Amino acid sequence: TQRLANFLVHSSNNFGAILSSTNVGSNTY
Amino acid sequence: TQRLANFLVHSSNNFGAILSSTNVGSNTY
Amino acid sequence: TQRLANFLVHSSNNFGAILSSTNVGSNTY
Amino acid sequence: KCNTATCATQRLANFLVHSSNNFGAILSSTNVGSNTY
Amino acid sequence: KCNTATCATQRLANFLVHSSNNFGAILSSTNVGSNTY
Amino acid sequence: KCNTATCATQRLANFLVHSSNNFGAILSSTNVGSNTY
Amino acid sequence: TQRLANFLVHSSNNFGAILSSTNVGSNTY
Amino acid sequence: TQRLANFLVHSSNNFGAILSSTNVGSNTY
Amino acid sequence: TQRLANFLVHSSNNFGAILSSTNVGSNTY
Amino acid sequence: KCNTATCATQRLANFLVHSSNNFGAILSSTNVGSNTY
Amino acid sequence: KCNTATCATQRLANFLVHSSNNFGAILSSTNVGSNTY
Amino acid sequence: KCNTATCATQRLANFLVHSSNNFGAILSSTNVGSNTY
């Protein structure tokens, strides 16, 4: 038997500046 | 028997400056 | 029998400056 | 609570109190990525 | 609580209190990535 | 609490108190990555 | 006396690939 | 007396690949 | 007397690959 | 030519000969800035 | 040429001969800035 | 040429001959800045 359960809680709170720059394969020239 | 359970809580709080720059394969010129 | 359980809590709080620059394969020129 | 076996309980405590009582002057300047030319 | 066997309980304590009571002048300047030319 | 065997309990204590009571002048300058030309 | 003369000849010839990217103040995110 | 004369000849020829990337003040994120 | 003369000849020829990346003040993140 | 004084003559020689006589197969691929995903 | 004084003559010689006579197969691949994902 | 004084003549010689006679197979691969993922 397989009793699998994923409890994924992703809480994110911001009260200031965020500069989240993600470059997956980006090529700047 | 397999009793598997993943309790993943990812809490992130910000009150200031964040510059999260992730370059997965990025190539700057 | 396998009784596996992962309790992963990832709490991160910021009150100041953060410059998190991660370069996984990035090539700067 | 748990009696027989295989007992796992995790308790998380998080009383974050961010109190800022400004009775005066605050001159802040947040510049993330800016560039003054 | 747990009686027989396989007893794991984890307790996390987090009373974070960030108190800032400014009765005067604060001249802050946060520059993350900025460049003054 | 645990009676028979296999007893593991972990307790974490975290009373962080960051108190900053400025009754005067603070001239701060945080420059992370900045470059003044 | 001032006898000033500027002989400025700017000759440019191309027979192949050129990628001339000039960023005077440009800010890529 | 001032006898000034500037003979500026700027000849450039290309027969292949050129990637001339100049960043005067450019800020990549 | 001032007899000044500038003979500036700037000849550049290419037959292959060139990657001329100049960063005067550029800040990569 | 110049006889008395202040004699400056500059001669530039430029016989560039780019000759390419392909009697066979040339498989070239110029990729400047391209990105094959 | 120049007789009295202040004699400056500069001669530049440039016989560049780029000859490429391909009687066979050339498999070239110029990749400047490219990125094969 | 120059007779009296102040004699400066500079001669530059440049017979560059780049000859490439390929009677066979050339497998070249120029990768400047490329990144094969």
| D14 in Cβ contact with E13 (< 8 Å) | no
Rounded to the nearest 5 degrees, what angle is found at the Cα of E15, between the Cα atoms of E12 and E20? 155
With CB atoms and an 8 Å threshold, state whether I27 touches F33.
Answer: yes
Contacts of E35 in chain H (CB under 8 A): 25, 27
Q: Which of J18, J32, J34, J35 to substitute to test the interface with G, most G CBs within 10 Å?
A: J32
Determination technique used: cryo-EM
- The tokens describing G5, both together, are 């003369």
Contacts of I29 in chain E (CB under 8 A): 33
| K20 in Cβ contact with K27 (< 8 Å) | no
Instruction: Give the residue from chain G lying closest to H12, CA to CA.
Output: G12
Chains that touch H (3 or more CB pairs under 8 A): A, B, D, E, G, I, J, K, L
Residue G21: closest CA among H22, A26, B29: H22
Which DSSP letter does residue L9 get?
E
Contacts of J31 in chain K (CB under 8 A): 29-34
- Residue window 8-27, chain E: list those with CB within 8 Å of chain D: 8-27
**Residue position matching structure tokens 């994120």:** H29
Contacts of D14 in chain B (CB under 8 A): 11
Angstroms from L29 CA to nearest CA on chain B: 20
Amino acid at C19: L
3-state secondary structure at position E24: coil
With CB atoms and an 8 Å threshold, state whether E35 touches I29.
Answer: no
* Given resolution (angstroms): 3.2
Residue D12: closest CA among C1, B7, L23, F29: B7
With CB atoms and an 8 Å threshold, state whether K35 touches B27.
Answer: yes
N- to C-terminal Cα separation, chain K: 65
| B3 in Cβ contact with C2 (< 8 Å) | yes
- The tokens describing F9, both together, are 């309990």
**Residue position matching structure tokens 């065997």:** F5
Asked if J touches C (at least 3 Cβ pairs < 8 angstroms), the answer reads: no
Burial class (CB in 10 A: 0-12, 13-18, 19+), I6: exposed
- Range F4-24 burial, b when 16+ CB lie within 10 A, else e: eeeeeeeeeeeeeeeeeebee
Burial class (CB in 10 A: 0-12, 13-18, 19+), D36: exposed
Residue E35: closest CA among I28, A26, G29: I28
Asked if A touches G (at least 3 Cβ pairs < 8 angstroms), the answer reads: yes
* Cα gap G18→H18, rounded to integer Å: 5
Asked if A touches F (at least 3 Cβ pairs < 8 angstroms), the answer reads: no
Instruction: Give me the residues paired with residue K31 across strands.
Output: J31, L31
Select from E10, E12, E30 the Cβ nearest to the Cβ of C17: E30
N- to C-terminal Cα separation, chain L: 65
* Cα gap K26→I17, rounded to integer Å: 17
Q: What are phi and psi of F23, to 5 degrees?
A: -95, 5
With CB atoms and an 8 Å threshold, state whether F35 touches I27.
Answer: yes
Residue E17: closest CA among A29, D5, C15: C15
Instruction: Give the residue from chain A lying closest to H29, CA to CA.
Output: A21
With CB atoms and an 8 Å threshold, state whether K32 touches H15.
Answer: no
Q: What are phi and psi of K18, to 5 degrees?
A: -105, 95
Instruction: Give the residue from chain G lying closest to H6, CA to CA.
Output: G6
CA D18 to chain centre: 8
- The tokens describing D10, both together, are 């995790």
* Cα gap E31→E37, rounded to integer Å: 14
CA dist H12 to I11, I12, I13, I20, J10, Å? 6, 5, 6, 14, 19
Rounded to the nearest 5 degrees, what angle is found at the Cα of I10, between the Cα atoms of I7 and I11? 130
**Residue B9, C-beta contacts closer than 8 angstroms, at least 6 positions apart:** A7, A9, A11, C8, C9, C10, C11, D12
| J13 in Cβ contact with L16 (< 8 Å) | no
Instruction: Give the residue from chain K lying closest to L19, CA to CA.
Output: K19
* Cα gap L24→B20, rounded to integer Å: 53
- Range G15-27 burial, b when 16+ CB lie within 10 A, else e: eebbbebebeeeb
